[PDB]
Design a protein around this ligand. Sequence first.
Ligand SMILES: Nc1ncnc2c1ncn2[C@@H]1O[C@H](COP(=O)(O)OP(=O)(O)O)[C@@H](O)[C@H]1O
Ligand SMILES: Nc1ncnc2c1ncn2[C@@H]1O[C@H](COP(=O)(O)OP(=O)(O)O)[C@@H](O)[C@H]1O
Lengths: 356, 347
Amino acid sequence: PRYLGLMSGTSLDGMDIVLIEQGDRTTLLASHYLPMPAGLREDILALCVPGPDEIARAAEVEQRWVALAAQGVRELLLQQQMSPDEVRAIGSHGQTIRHEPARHFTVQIGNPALLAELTGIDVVADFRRRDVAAGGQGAPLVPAFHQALFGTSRAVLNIGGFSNVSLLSPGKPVRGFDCGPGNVLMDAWIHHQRGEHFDRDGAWAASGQVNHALLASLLADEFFAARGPKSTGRERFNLPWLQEHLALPAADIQATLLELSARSISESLLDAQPDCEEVLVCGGGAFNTALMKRLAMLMPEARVASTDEYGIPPAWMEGMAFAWLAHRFLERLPGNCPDVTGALGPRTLGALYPAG
Amino acid sequence: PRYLGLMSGTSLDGMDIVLIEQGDRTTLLASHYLPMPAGLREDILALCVPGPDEIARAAEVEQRWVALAAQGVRELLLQQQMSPDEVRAIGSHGQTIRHEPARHFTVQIGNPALLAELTGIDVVADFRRRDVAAGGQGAPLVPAFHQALFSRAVLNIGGFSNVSLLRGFDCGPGNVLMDAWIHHQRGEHFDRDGAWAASGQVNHALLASLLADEFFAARGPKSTGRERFNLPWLQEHLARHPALPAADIQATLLELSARSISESLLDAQPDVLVCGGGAFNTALMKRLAMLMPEARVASTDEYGIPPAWMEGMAFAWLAHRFLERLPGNCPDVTGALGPRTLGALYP
Ligand SMILES: Nc1ncnc2c1ncn2[C@@H]1O[C@H](COP(=O)(O)OP(=O)(O)O)[C@@H](O)[C@H]1O
Ligand SMILES: Nc1ncnc2c1ncn2[C@@H]1O[C@H](COP(=O)(O)OP(=O)(O)O)[C@@H](O)[C@H]1O
């Protein structure tokens, strides 16, 4: 059947909507991007830390997030000349505002009932919560999808705000984990500094020089040393965390942050899978040519290429994964990988809000 | 099939678990009550008003609420000699911590994913949200159930009172103020048999001042909660007159619930089945019988259903309705645009 995938990751660049055909295989039929309005992006970031009146605030931000999503869904369907009745379901990741697997909770907003009401399409949402309930990290969730798409020893690497890898070693459980920062700090820094939203092509970082004293200080953070099932978010790597370390030319700090993402990816990758022959890059980090060059030279044993070479545009991989999870829900097939998340075992992920 | 109903209303007395058989009819197979721990009750009440760190706090309270719930489900099933696999699904109402239909939102916590994980039974939850999305109040939800079960008025008296005219709406305070007052005063949780209220005398100046509140004058689809009727609201009214005997304020609160129920009821249907814990307030039951002399005022016990478990039964029933893809709201009770499938499935 046909599924919609609705993604809005921690970078807050915008909302991704994908349409896939699912049968034997997964095929991208169409994609649709709606940029995040500055007001909504800042209100979401404001919910990402503890604060007052969060229940009412989150409910109001939620309404706006869903209105935007449903707008995107309607535009996409009209542009593809298809009615809502041709889509089996929407896989909605929602919007994470708090991810605390050490406190056994993760909070994704995105009023799926209102999404069902606005779209006329069944919604599958709230994927991470069952994995956490079964003792897991609730992240990463893409590995089951990466395996189904690309399961030779391959690593599939997502570089969004944070980086995560899916290690596909034949005759083993799928393994994976969040490597650490992807674009999050490089975004945070060029925003604190130049007001910008990201460092295009990594050209600002390229103009700088790595500071080895800063780099080693950042690498020595406790998260990097941990092995196996691990996840992170805006809770650990953020601007106030960088400044605590900084306490030097701005461009140099930017070069150093790019290196931190390159190094924390290679070392966590090659440690867990030295035989890695192939590294498939997805997410918006795949477009950072500077970062892509550093990854190719820190893992010389493997070919470092974007998923575009293998038939999937790197920007839509995550959205495709969430549409795919709606299908898994509806077929009653497990969505997590217990050895990625550390959950007790395989679980059906999500809940169904029917259009009715 | 067999369904579990999980209810924990606004009074926070405890958690109700019911087992029903559903086919042609709805039959109560078993019930199970777990009192609310004082710690958990107070932390829930603390989430019922704006405050700091609510997302983390609500998530932690939720974990405890669901652990308790699952504990009750397991005890009940063991005691009835049945495995989780004989139950089709759990209908979970969750716990309301904020209901604001005028702001188009209602917030019921109760981590259904964790409830499914702990029980091994499919969970249907988050019933009110779709009705609110379709422009409704998201309350009351019991009228579709009352209609399937039973010119009658079916009257639930929990923290708040609602009636199903066989249309419906929340009449106003049930036990909420009488509970709030005997707790502010005597530390107690409720006024047993309404014996404290019975020992007092109604103050007509206070009563008329309370009845003149804007909510009572409104007609048709309306809902309320701890947001409107609460202790700080009563005290605001008590300040106008000088000191007044506590028992007399209690008698007056009981009268306010009796009057707001009769007048809203008889207005909308001049031509009465009592459920909820208010059915056990004999003092209130006596005043209701004398304020509506046209009708027989009896508890649902006379009609085959224990008044304490009616709401839990309603939510087990709503799980069935979800699974059969049948509407769960009554558009003319809630003011939603039309019939909707209520809830979401956590398998
Ligand atoms: N042309 C580009 N050059 C360098 N970086 C880019 C480019 N395009 C996107 N990015 C980076 O990728 C990020 C967004 O990628 P995305 O996969 O959507 O992450 P997320 O799902 O967490 O929002 C942007 O914030 C930006 O840092
Ligand atoms: N024996 C009793 N005497 C007087 N009031 C009672 C008695 N038993 C229960 N109640 C009232 O019923 C309330 C709880 O009933 P309930 O139907 O569960 O409402 P809710 O949905 O708000 O939890 C108590 O707080 C109390 O006021």
